[PDB]
């Protein structure tokens, strides 16, 4: 309600939600997942 | 150049990541067109790195997501999910 | 019905099921799946 | 348990599940799934 002052639609359509409707999802940017490869996928990504 | 083997490049692909997203009961998930009126340029630029090692040609490789301002929270990406 | 003698509720609420309701799932303990890693996931599991 | 090898720092790693009495069936884990 403080970061969205200069838009009236922002204030209205955030105020439509309850104190439980809006949830974060803190997404980690550090994947623990090996990016799978293959020399077709290797070379053709390099070719594209 | 990431695939060439220069391991120190953070590619900033502009305007991928939203924050303010309706989660309606319908089968779509809409980003909020009011909180993001620029529906292609209120999305955030995404900083992208690799991650390579030795055996411990190529090796064991990974990828990284950051945004243009991931300084306080470098790894955590916030969401604002408007669920009905 | 023989392993659950000293509980009456066990006998009743197993006898509620038909001769087809209760199925096993023999789970192999030997995964063929490489546990994916990353030196953030490596080090921060070690740090935690 | 884990499961490590050489190249054939770390290596190709895995994990193992057994129970405290996995002696007759060391790898198989039984389920008793009461489906309605």
B77 phi and psi, to 5 degrees?
Answer: -110, 120
B81 phi and psi, to 5 degrees?
Answer: -100, 110
Distance CA D17, CA C30 (A): 7
Query: Which among C20, C41, B57, B74 is positioned nearest to D36, based on CA atoms?
Result: C20
D26 phi and psi, to 5 degrees?
Answer: -75, -40
Burial of B35 (0-12, 13-18, 19+ CB in 10 A): buried
CB B20 within 8 A of CB B79: no
Burial of B63 (0-12, 13-18, 19+ CB in 10 A): middle
In eight-state DSSP terms, residue B32 is: -
Phi-psi region of A23 (alpha: psi -120 to 50; beta: other; left: phi over 0): beta
Beta carbons of B65 and A29 less than 8 Å apart: yes
Instruction: With beta carbons under 8 A apart, name residues in chain C contacting A32.
Output: 36-38, 40-41
CB B34 within 8 A of CB A10: yes
Distance CA A39, CA A45 (A): 10
List the subunits that have 3+ CB pairs under 8 angstroms with D: B, C
Query: Which among D28, A22, C45, C44 is positioned nearest to B83, based on CA atoms?
Result: A22
Mutate to test the interface with D, among C30, C34, C41, C45 (most CBs of D within 10 A): C30
User: For chain A, first and last CA: distance in Å?
Assistant: 45
Query: Which among B22, B14, B20 is positioned nearest to B41, based on CA atoms?
Result: B14
Query: Which among B45, B58, B46 is positioned nearest to B7, based on CA atoms?
Result: B58
Residues of B with CB under 8 A from a CB of A: 3, 32, 34-35, 37, 58, 60-66, 70, 73-84
Convert B3-31 to b/e letters by CB count within 10 Å (16 or more is b).
eeeeeeeeeeeeeebbbbbbbeeeeeeeb
Sign of the dihedral through C-alpha C24, C26, C29, C33:
negative
Cβ atoms within 10 A of the Cβ of D34, count? 11
Distance CA B32, CA B29 (A): 9
Token pair for C47: 């740090």
Residues of C with CB under 8 A from a CB of B: 37-40
Longest dimension (CA), chain D: 49
Instruction: With beta carbons under 8 A apart, name residues in chain C contacting A34.
Output: 34, 36-38
CB B74 within 8 A of CB B18: no
Residue A1 Cα, gap to closest chain B Cα (Å): 12
Token pair for A4: 């969205």
How far out from the chain centre does Cα C41 lie? 26
Enumerate residues 6+ apart whose C-beta is below 8 A from B7: B50, B52
Strands, DSSP E only, in B1-84? 11-17, 20-23, 44-51, 62-67, 76-77, 80-83
User: Between D16, D27, D33, which is nearest C23 by CB?
Assistant: D33
């Amino acid at each position: 309600s403080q970061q969205f002052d200069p838009y009236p639609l922002a204030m209205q359509f955030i105020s439509q939600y309850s104190p439980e409707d809006i949830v974060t999802a803190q997404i980690e940017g550090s994947s623990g997942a090996l990016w799978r490869i293959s020399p077709p996928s290797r070379a053709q990504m390099k070719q594209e | 150049q990431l695939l060439e083997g220069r391991p120190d490049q953070s590619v900033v692909i502009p305007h991928l990541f939203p924050k303010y997203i309706r989660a309606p009961n319908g089968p779509e998930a809409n980003p909020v067109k009011q909180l993001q009126p620029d529906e292609e340029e209120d999305y955030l630029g995404v900083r992208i790195q690799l991650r390579r090692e030795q055996v411990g040609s190529d090796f064991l490789e990974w990828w990284v997501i950051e945004l243009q301002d991931c300084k306080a929270d470098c790894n955590l990406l916030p969401m604002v999910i408007f669920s009905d």
